[PDB]
Amino acid sequence: MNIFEMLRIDEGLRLKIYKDTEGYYTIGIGHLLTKSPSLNAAKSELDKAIGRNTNGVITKDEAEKLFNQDVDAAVRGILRNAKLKPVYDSLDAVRRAALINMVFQMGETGVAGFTNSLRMLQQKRWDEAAVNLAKSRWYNQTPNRAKRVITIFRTGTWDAYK
Ligand SMILES: [Cl-]
Ligand SMILES: [Cl-]
Secondary structure (H helix, E strand, O other), X not given: OOHHHHHHHHHOOEXXXXXXXXXXXXXXXXXXXXXXXXXXXXXXXXXXHHOOOOOOEOOHHHHHHHHHHHHHHHHHXXXXXXXXXXXXXXXXXXXXXXXXXXXXXXXXXXXXXXXXXXXXXXXXXXXXXXXXHHXXXXXXXXHHHHHXXXXXXXXXXXXXXX
16 A cells, blocks of 8 residues: 555546545546636636647546645655644654644644644554544545545554555
8 A cells, every 4th residue: 555546546547627525626546626616717727737739637547646736745745744744753654644643634724723633643642633633524524535544644554545
């Protein structure tokens, strides 16, 4: 298991524009296009991202390329954030994947906001962090996914995804 396989399981793969759990236009492997309610704005963003007049549909290859970029960006986002960086540096390789997943789903800013949880992860207080992470809108809105991610922080293994 690795970050790419992990995220492919959580987000799935769709080659036509679709709406995410929050109702925003998305494509590929969880690639958010726009928060705007307009399909046209979505199509415009898609074309600009791919570099061609798309018709709202992309190929597998294009979807993978946006996926690679997005994972790269999530990592860099963590490394550049003052609140995240120290946490990431303190974690083992499996748990690092869990943090990237959260940033990929909610953004750097969003994650950076889990102040207390972050301090507990840094302290290696796994069960306590797991409970704290659960008291969140994130958990209540996408509980199965959150449970998988939290199980990783709790156990340090990939069992949740196997
Ligand atoms: Cl992009
Ligand atoms: Cl879910």
